[PDB]
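Q: I'm writing a short methods note and want an example of a predicted protein-small molecule complex. Could you take the sequence and the SMILES for 2-ethylpyridine-4-carboximidothioic acid and return the bound structure as tokens? Please keep the output block clean; save any remarks for afterwards.
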Amino acid sequence: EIEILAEKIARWARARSAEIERDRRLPDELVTRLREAGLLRATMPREVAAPELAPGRALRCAEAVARGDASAGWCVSIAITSALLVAYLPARSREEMFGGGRGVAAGVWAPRGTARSVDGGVVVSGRWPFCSGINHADIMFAGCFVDDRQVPSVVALNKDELQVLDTWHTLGLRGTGSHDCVADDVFVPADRVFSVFDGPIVDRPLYRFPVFGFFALSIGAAALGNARAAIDDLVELAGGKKGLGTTRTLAERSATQAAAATAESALGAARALFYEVIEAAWQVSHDAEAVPVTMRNRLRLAATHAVRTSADVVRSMYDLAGGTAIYDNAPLQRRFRDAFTATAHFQVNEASRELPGRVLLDQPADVSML
Ligand SMILES: Cc1cc2nc3c(=O)[nH]c(=O)nc-3n(C[C@H](O)[C@@H](O)[C@H](O)COP(=O)(O)O)c2cc1C
Ligand SMILES: CCc1cc(C(=N)S)ccn1
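A: Understood, no commentary inside the block.
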């Protein structure tokens, strides 16, 4: 049923999409809707009054919201990924920050922070770009290195303690407000410092599902929903777009027909693989052993394929629309700008094909972050 709420919320995001972009943030009323549906805490554990939603359902919700507006969808993706880390907190700090239904999380994985140990915890400083959703998050999980360690850690920071810098001036995904955040000698109690590589404290199937795979897949979900919206925009425009020569509509051209078919099947294929691998990994997340590397590899293969295929689909629809889509009032223009902002994400760029290829070819590979 959360899926039905997500589709309703997608229609609200679509209605507000000009405001989202103009203000570089989600309207308060839209955040309230998302919160009341449980979408911004969907994957947090049941102990904090949260749905602990199965990953395929959560990702389908993000995809649905992104079809309404890619930035709104991306904020769901980042919220439901960051929410997983609530399962890595000791019970005391988990209750403090997320108990009784409280707390929305943001999260930047890049270990930009430097943390020094002190009596009771660490003192951390750093600057993190790409803090999606910080405008409506209470807590930001941030990567850092603690003293001498060569394996990075995560600190759970209150937004209160950070300086948010106005840096998010971007081609697309403007509504994500993915600004830089700065910590200046912030004290973090020891029980808000952890290592993802040590695994969750809440050891149930949702947190056995590959966490780095889920993050990648959440970007795929937003990209896929955006590409679906782009096809829908094209199809609506074509047929009515008549032009001024004595040929006729855009939809009546063979090239438009072949391109529509090519895009529809490419997107359908990417989406089908996406949900197939999620379900396969979800099944084995119920087993005693850690989800294996072969399965983790399939998730990363599918996430990157989804983002890259989505961009190819949106580029094709934009190109078909010709002089219509170059203007700021054209819906396809924002889809295009959003699709080509999403492609830059480090989990799903062209470079992200190389490690999953090494795994396929049985080559030596560091798979700690697969
Ligand atoms: C619109 C957008 C929002 C992003 N949000 C986050 C985030 O909240 N947390 C994170 O670890 N990465 C996030 N990323 C990943 C990086 O921002 C990605 O864009 C990066 O720029 C790729 O190169 P890099 O290695 O310099 O980070 C985001 C990326 C984009 C494009
Ligand atoms: C998601 C990629 C990544 C993860 C981490 C650790 N989880 S902190 C560090 C660097 N890069």
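A: Remarks, as requested: Residues 196-370 form one domain. Residues 78, 107-110, 130-132, 173, 176, 178, 341, 344-346 surround flavin mononucleotide (ligand 1) (CB under 6 Å).
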